[PDB]
Design a protein around this ligand. Structure first.
Ligand code: 7SM
Ligand code: B7G
Ligand code: B7G
Ligand code: B7G
Length: 271
């Protein structure tokens, strides 16, 4: 009985995912591997190719809309911020497309997004990453990991840990239908500080995890220990976000000319 009900539940979460996210892992891997396309991403690996990309690639966020130019490393940070905020927007609409999330009081919705979106962002980020770099500008660009390493501290340091996480996460070979459930479980988390209706959120979280376990039995029948591996990745994401927030505090303290987006300020306020 419940195996069948949870299958339906999972399909509605997958549909929420397909409706709301700009890029799927399926599309991202087809770009990263070269698989079937008349166009290849422009590679950004140094200052000259960065300038050419700002001149010539199509950006969701127009360069003139970014804060005033300071230097190369900050400019990259500002592009990172733009994408982070765009993904918060997508995660919010994904969450709101899940009925049991929308049925929560709005203040609990905000609490879940506040403490869950970065975890979800760093999980979804793996979809566009390989060991050598990541996709940018809706897949029309590829920024090398080596170039990102060459940025000055603190900006290079806040980037590299996410690659380290992503390469290990991608070795589990999740597809979009697995990720939709994984991300929903990250957002619908009963552990978040200040939740008003903890039992309700705990119950939803449990349903999603049961759906995930069963989804993996069907979709990855040969993969041993995959469900417990993913619970551990959820734990790992919490630690990755703690470190990230600590690094952001140092950027706020020491990089005083760097602007932080007001929405992210609200997210870090009580972290
Ligand atoms: C010319 O254009 C470019 C040049 C060079 C790099 C880029 C670029 C590179 C990476 C992204 C990106 O997709 N992201 C950012 C990202 C990716 C990996 C590691 C870290 C990281 O952000 C850390 C800072 C986050 C601050 C916000 C905060 O939380 O307060 C995804 C997370 C969203 C977009 C754009 C564009
Ligand atoms: C203000 C300092 C920080 C500026 C750098 C980040 C700007 O990002 C963009 O800002 C818009 C304003 O909300 C969002 O709507 C977009 O989704 C987001 O991509
Ligand atoms: C359902 C609409 C009416 C909601 C009214 C309740 C608002 O509560 C506020 O929720 C915020 C998180 O969302 C917390 O950060 C605040 O501390 C808390 O005061
Ligand atoms: C778009 C969803 C992303 C959530 C954005 C981050 C939430 O910020 C919080 O908003 C609450 C008001 O609602 C305040 O009470 C809190 O002090 C503040 O930390």
């Amino acid at each position: 009985p419940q195996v069948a009900d949870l299958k339906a539940f999972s399909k509605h979460i997958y549909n929420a995912y397909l409706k709301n996210f700009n890029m799927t892992k399926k599309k991202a891997r087809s770009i990263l591997t070269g698989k079937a396309s008349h166009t290849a991403p422009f590679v950004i690996h140094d200052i000259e190719t960065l300038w050419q990309a700002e001149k010539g690639l199509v950006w969701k966020q127009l360069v003139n809309g970014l804060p005033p130019y300071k230097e190369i490393s900050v400019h990259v940070f500002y592009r990172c911020q733009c994408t982070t905020v765009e993904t918060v927007r997508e995660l919010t609409e994904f969450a709101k497309s899940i009925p049991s999330f929308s049925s929560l009081f709005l203040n609990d919705q905000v609490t879940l997004l506040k403490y869950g979106v970065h975890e979800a962002i760093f999980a979804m980020l793996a979809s566009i990453v390989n060991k050598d770099g990541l996709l940018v500008a809706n897949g029309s660009g590829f920024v090398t990991r080596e170039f990102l390493r060459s940025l000055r501290k603190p900006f290079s340091d806040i980037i590299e840990p996410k690659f380290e996480f992503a390469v290990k996460f991608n070795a589990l070979e999740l597809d979009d239908s697995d990720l939709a459930l994984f991300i929903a479980a990250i957002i619908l988390c009963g552990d978040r500080p200040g939740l008003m209706n903890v039992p309700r959120v705990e119950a939803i979280q449990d349903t999603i995890l049961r759906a995930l376990e069963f989804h993996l039995q069907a979709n990855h029948p040969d993969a041993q220990y995959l469900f417990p591996k993913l619970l551990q990745k959820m734990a790992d994401l919490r630690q990755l976000v703690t470190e990230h927030a600590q690094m952001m505090q140092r950027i706020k303290k020491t990089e005083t000319e760097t602007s932080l987006h007001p929405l992210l300020q609200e997210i870090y306020k009580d972290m």
